[PDB]
Amino acid sequence: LIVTQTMKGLDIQKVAGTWYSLAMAASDISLLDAQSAPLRVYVEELKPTPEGDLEILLQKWENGECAQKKIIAEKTKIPAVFKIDALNENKVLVLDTDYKKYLLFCMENQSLACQCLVRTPEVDDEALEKFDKALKALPMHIRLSFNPTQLEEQCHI
Ligand SMILES: CCCCOc1ccc(OCCCN2CCOCC2)cc1
């Protein structure tokens, strides 16, 4: 109950496939500051299951290397809200998407990280505008964005 933008009418099957973390923001600098920061994660692909859960492939920098991760976000009664199982209850919210170009999401435990996902390794000014508007509300204190060259590299090097 801190992020209160969600996507009405979300069809989670339609988010399947390839995505690029074009921009990210968080409530605390420490959540994204170093390469190995806990929530500096780079999304690779979204794989919605038949039962409506959402499997997520990503990379993360750990121990001086770009590690692959696979995680599962389980559906809830709200179609735009999913839960991930770590030792704390942390939920994922889909704020807005057009399926074909962009998707905005936040994860929250208050600790909060949001990303602007895009389908192609290109700077979508309009997707970034909608991301910044969705965020102007929220209490973000660090924001990163990535150029096309970085978006084609593992962990955005
Ligand atoms: C529409 C769904 C977009 C994908 O949302 C998420 C992307 C990455 C996430 O990762 C959260 C942190 C994952 N852990 C980082 C530390 O290593 C273990 C995995 C969570 C949701």
Sequence ranges of the domains in the chain: 1-157
Q: How far is the CA of 114 from the centre of ligand 1 (A)?
A: 10
Q: How far is CA 131 from the centre of its chain?
A: 11
CA-based R_g, the chain, Å: 14
Residue 130 CB coordination number (10 Å): 17
Are 37 and 24 a contacting pair, CB within 8 Å? no
What does the DSSP 8-state code read for residue 14?
Answer: G
Are 60 and 42 a contacting pair, CB within 8 Å? yes
Residue ID of nearest Cα to ligand 1 atom 11: 39
Experiment used for this model: X-ray
Question: What amino acid is encoded at 88 in this protein?
Answer: N
Resolution value, angstrom units: 2.0
Cα distances from 143 to residues 8, 36, 148, 153, in angstroms, run 26, 16, 17, 19
Q: Assign residue 4 a region: left if phi > 0, alpha if psi is -120 to 50, beta otherwise?
A: alpha
Choices 3.30.750.80, 1.10.530.10, 2.40.420.20, 2.40.128.20: CATH for 1-157: 2.40.128.20
* Residue indicated by tokens 């399926």: 99
Tell me the C-alpha distance between 148 and 18, whole Å.
15
Question: What angle is formed at CA 126 by the lines to CA 123 and CA 127, rounded to 5 degrees?
Answer: 75
Determine if ligand 1 sits within 6 Å of the CB of residue 12. Answer: no
